[PDB]
């Protein structure tokens, strides 16, 4: 039965792709989605029989790399941590599959889309169920491959091609660290499996000989793993791809940009919990990077005027928050916020797509005005999703953001205080641009054109049921999961998540709260609401357009161009690489320099020496 | 041209295994850094040279050069797994490079241009060739699940166990492998279609469709289950690594 | 001089820069109830001189206008999605007019 | 010119007349080959832990509560 959870999406994808001419644009739509929904039901059954009936399930199919004491196997780890993400991936994947059939009814190449989606579902199921680093590495690379294929769904679209290529290169440079990590942890344990290193992961205490100087061993491994997670979580290092990734279709973006591949980098840390806690040095830099990325994205999203672009920066801010949660040994709030996020940002993505494709395929803030009363359903949906996003008190998002900020405040380490400050000041930014999105659309005089309003058509029923399900979820799941999994020592995780005795600050994160800091992010939220309403509804005569002399237009450009990262990084790394791959390697190394030994280098040498020898 | 990179390229590299490593046990150890400092910079310089290339044939040859320079690192790193991974990578490369040159030659036998500038938007037509080309590019892209990744993962493992510096430079090779091969794939069979140059063109008939079938089946077979290849030669690699010394 | 080629260039640049200024005014003015007053201000600014006859007093004016206009650009200007630069440019372009596909290729005898 | 190219994964708007008939076969095809995956997995899924409550997987499985000791692997 447990094999049916993973192999059915692959089988559906393979049969749909091979026989996409035998099945119409609707046969594959009703077949692959049905297979994915069956897989989701199987995942729910596994969750009932594992999460509540606490007994993890283990298996091994066949040896992949049966070399000497490097046993690689096709086994899976159906663990308590894994099955929660089984639910998260399967439910959202099935809902996205139901979402796309309405959207793709007009897009010609329909069956290829569900084929790609099912490939992605199979790859990430293989990743999350995996138990070996290398066998998890195939899922890690397959997620990137499916991301490239889906963003490259529009081969004619020139921008999509460049975005896909750049995404592949940056993701490769990112998971470079994780790829080094597999064989870094192998040279100390002579094994690659999870159960044989989490049993004894604290024993090694020696050093290494790296490229420059001798450093720590476990800390270096954890640093490499975090650098690998950077590429798949859009951290401070390489987050050039996600802001430009929304050049493809919408229904996939609800699954690849804000729901599941989001979870890859954080789940890297979450799965290997009893490895980072024994490397305190890596935890501190992880916290720095997570807080920096979260703040950077939160202040990035505010200026942009597109539906998908701004919410990508919100996703990156949640990435930073979750990376910090995984950086302070408080992995509980990390997975709790992951489960919440996969609901209240996938819902917002579906709502944004519904309002985009129903309005003549326009995604803008400057041009589109207000049409809230034209259709109340998906606006009510997106309002619920936003209320979760800000984390209004006693909602799904509150039970994660409040506790994660409190945990940030409690830890007095040099990274805990700094990152708590950064999160507190980023709450204002996120509550500002979320309500900016709520206001610049649907709450202003309509600035659109007179033809698109006439051609208005609400969300079709088949695409509204996933929204209904997500709205039902991200209003009760927070309350249902607050007690059962973050409840001061809940006994269902077992070995899935291990927290060291020393760095366990949970009870004093609730019973030592000053009550002047726990309820403060609601205060920044309401202040952001006030300032956004004032600027974007009434006081916009001078607070909106700033036609000053200098230092204010450049302030606009600095955040619009996202700190010129796409400029400085490009020109100083890839432009230089492309220049010196033609004017250095192809000039003074092989062609031209040592080519004085091939044609025209020695051929003319023997046109003089051999000539003056007959006479 | 499909056996210059097929079997004519494996003589010297395999010649190292049979007539250099067990022959001169005390000299390879003394010359190990020289081979490292040659191959590590080769995988970088050749890969960078690959990017600024226009001919369709030359890019595949340069990728082959990079793959051979990578396998040379794992061969001289004397490990029971390094040499086995070297042999797996050499077999996988013999498959994938052969397939890639057939894929880029079937285009030449119809249009005779050998220029990426003319080629473009070949997914709107001949989709079967596009699918085959994408699969073989992924195999050259060094993805797990294909026989190559089994090939260079063992190379990296063998190199890192001996020297930490060489492994990072070698893995820079598989990082940079995504810069030219994927760019070629997106610039040849996924661009904007131009009727000015490619006025008319057909797709693969029954001959070249069956040609790639053994390549595909062998690729998948040695990628997902490389046990038999490693099973058949664990004794010989063990004998080759343990030679001259007695500890 | 009596050559209208120079002045036709002036009557061309004025319309081009006015159109670009109105576009940028629309971009900066996200809300429109300020866009009316801003557009009125731009139109009135273009009527400040409205009487130039000398050729020596136009090049400096056009240079100053171009320099001032380029100082604020709204780094994210409006482009129609199907326009050359939009969000669905080359979404699903019409297939090329004349291209044929031969069937029996690679046969023998 | 779209009709000339095969488009193995289906054309842009490939709509066969009997697509329901093919979909019935395709869905039946998945089910018949899914059984060997389920049947072959029954000899697998070793879980030495005994759940506090009975699950519904005892009928087709027996690899639970048996692999207790770890001294004879």
């Amino acid at each position: 039965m447990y094999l049916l959870i993973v192999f059915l999406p692959l089988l559906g994808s393979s049969v749909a792709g091979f026989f996409g001419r035998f099945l119409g644009s609707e046969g594959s739509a009703i077949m692959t989605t049905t297979c994915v929904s069956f897989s989701s039901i199987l995942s729910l059954i596994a969750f009932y029989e594992v999460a509540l009936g606490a007994s993890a399930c283990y298996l091994r199919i066949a040896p992949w790399i049966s070399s000497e004491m490097f046993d690689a196997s096709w086994g899976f780890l159906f663990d308590s941590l894994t099955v929660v993400m089984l639910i998260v991936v399967t439910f959202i994947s099935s809902l996205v599959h139901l979402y796309s059939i309405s959207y793709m009814s007009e897009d010609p190449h329909s069956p290829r889309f569900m084929c790609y989606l099912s490939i992605f579902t199979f790859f990430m199921l293989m990743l999350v169920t995996g138990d070996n680093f290398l066998q998890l590495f195939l899922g890690w690379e397959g997620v990137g491959l499916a991301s490239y294929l889906l963003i490259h769904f529009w081969f004619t679209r020139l921008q999509a091609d460049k975005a896909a290529i750049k995404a592949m290169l940056v993701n490769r440079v990112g998971d470079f660290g994780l790829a080094l990590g597999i064989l870094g942890c192998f040279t100390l344990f002579q094994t690659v499996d999870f159960s044989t290193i989490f049993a004894c992961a604290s024993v090694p205490r020696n050093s290494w000989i790296f490229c420059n100087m001798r450093l720590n061993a476990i800390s270096l491994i954890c640093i490499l793993l975090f650098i690998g997670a950077v590429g798949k979580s859009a951290q401070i290092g390489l987050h050039t791809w996600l802001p430009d990734a929304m050049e493809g279709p919408t229904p996939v973006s609800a699954l690849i940009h804000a729901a599941t591949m989001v979870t890859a980098g954080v789940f890297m840390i979450a799965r290997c919990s009893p490895l980072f806690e024994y490397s305190p040095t890596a935890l501190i830099v992880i916290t720095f990077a997570g807080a920096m990325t979260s703040f950077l994205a939160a202040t990035t999203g505010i200026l942009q005027n597109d539906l998908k672009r701004v919410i990508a920066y919100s996703t990156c801010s949640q990435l930073g928050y979750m990376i910090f949660a995984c950086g302070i040994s408080n992995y509980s709030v990390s997975v709790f916020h992951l489960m919440n996020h996969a609901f209240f940002k996938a819902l917002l993505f579906l709502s944004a797509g519904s309002v985009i494709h129903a309005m003549s395929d326009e995604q803008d803030m400057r041009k589109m005005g207000g049409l809230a009363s034209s259709f109340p359903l998906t606006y009510a949906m997106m309002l619920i999703g936003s209320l979760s996003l800000i984390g209004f008190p006693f909602l799904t998002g509150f039970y994660s953001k409040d506790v994660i900020l409190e945990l940030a405040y409690t830890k007095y380490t040099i990274s805990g205080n700094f990152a708590f400050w950064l999160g507190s000041v980023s709450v204002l930014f996120t509550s500002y641009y979320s309500f900016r999105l709520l206001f610049l659309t649907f709450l202003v005089p309509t600035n659109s054109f007179g033809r698109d309003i006439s051609r208005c058509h609400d969300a079709p029923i088949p695409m509204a049921i996933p929204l209904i399900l997500l709205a039902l979820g991200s209003l009760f799941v927070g309350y249902l999961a607050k007690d059962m999994m973050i409840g001061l020592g809940t006994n269902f995780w077992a070995n899935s998540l291990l927290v060291l005795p020393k760095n366990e600050i949970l009870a004093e994160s609730e019973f030592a709260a000053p009550t002047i800091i726990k309820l403060i992010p609601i205060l920044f939220s309401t202040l952001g609401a006030f300032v956004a309403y004032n600027v974007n509804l009434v006081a916009d005569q001078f607070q909106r357009a700033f036609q000053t002399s200098t230092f204010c237009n450049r302030l606009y450009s600095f955040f619009n161009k996202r700190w010129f990262f796409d400029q400085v990084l490009n020109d100083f790394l890839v432009r230089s690489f492309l220049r010196f791959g033609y004017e250095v390697s192809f000039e003074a190394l092989d062609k031209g320099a040592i080519e004085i030994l091939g044609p025209y280098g020695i051929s003319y040498t023997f046109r003089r020496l051999a000539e003056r020898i007959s006479q | 041209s499909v056996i210059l990179a097929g079997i004519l390229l494996k003589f010297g590299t395999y010649g190292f295994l049979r007539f250099s490593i067990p022959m001169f046990p005390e000299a390879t150890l003394c010359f190990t850094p020289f081979i490292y400092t040659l191959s590590a910079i080769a995988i970088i310089y050749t890969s960078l040279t690959t990017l600024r290339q226009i001919d369709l044939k030359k890019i595949i040859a340069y990728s082959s050069v990079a793959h051979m320079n990578l396998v040379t690192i794992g061969m001289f790193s004397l490990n029971i797994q390094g040499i086995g991974g070297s042999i797996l990578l050499m077999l996988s490369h013999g498959l994938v490079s052969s397939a890639l040159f057939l894929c880029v030659g079937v285009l030449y036998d119809r249009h005779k241009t050998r220029l990426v500038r003319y080629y473009g938007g070949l997914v709107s037509t001949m989709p079967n060739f596009s699918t085959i080309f994408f699969f073989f590019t992924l195999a050259n892209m060094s993805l797990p699940g294909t026989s190559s990744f089994i090939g260079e993962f063992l190379i990296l493992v063998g190199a890192f166990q001996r020297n930490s510096l060489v492994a990072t430079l070698a893995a820079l090779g598989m990082i940079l492998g995504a810069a030219y091969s994927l760019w070629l794939y997106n610039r040849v069979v996924s661009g904007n279609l131009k009727p000015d140059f490619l006025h008319k063109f057909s797709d693969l008939n029954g001959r070249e469709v069956f040609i790639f079938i053994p390549f595909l089946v062998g690729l998948v077979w040695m990628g997902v289950y490389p046990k038999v290849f490693l099973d058949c030669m664990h004794t010989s690699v063990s004998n080759l690594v343990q030679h001259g010394k007695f500890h | 001089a009596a050559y209208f080629a120079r002045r036709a260039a002036q009557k061309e640049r004025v319309r081009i820069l006015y159109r670009r200024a109105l576009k940028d005014t629309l971009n900066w003015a996200v809300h429109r109830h300020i866009f009316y007053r801003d557009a009125s201000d731009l139109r009135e600014k273009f009527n400040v001189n409205q009487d130039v006859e000398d050729v020596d007093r136009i090049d400096k004016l056009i240079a100053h206008g171009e320099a001032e206009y380029n100082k604020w650009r709204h780094p994210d200007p409006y482009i129609v999605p199907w326009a050359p630069g939009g969000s669905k440019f080359c979404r699903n372009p019409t297939p090329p007019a004349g291209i044929e596909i031969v069937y029996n290729y690679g046969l023998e005898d | 010119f779209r009709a000339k190219v095969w488009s193995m994964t289906g054309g842009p708007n490939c709509r066969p007349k009997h697509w329901r008939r093919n979909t019935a076969i395709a869905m039946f095809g998945v089910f018949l080959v899914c059984i060997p995956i389920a049947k072959l997995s029954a000899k697998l899924e070793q879980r030495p832990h005994m759940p506090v409550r009975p699950i519904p997987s005892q009928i087709w499985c027996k690899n639970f509560g048996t692999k207790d000791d770890y001294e004879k692997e």
Partner: peptide
């Protein structure tokens, strides 16, 4: 549009671009 028959007599394109012969004879 889930009940109307498809507007396709045959899947578009030829397998390996080989035109099928007249009915009755082999390949």
């Amino acid at each position: 549009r889930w009940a109307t028959p498809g507007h396709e007599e045959r899947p578009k394109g030829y397998f390996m671009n080989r035109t099928p012969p007249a009915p009755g004879q082999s390949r």
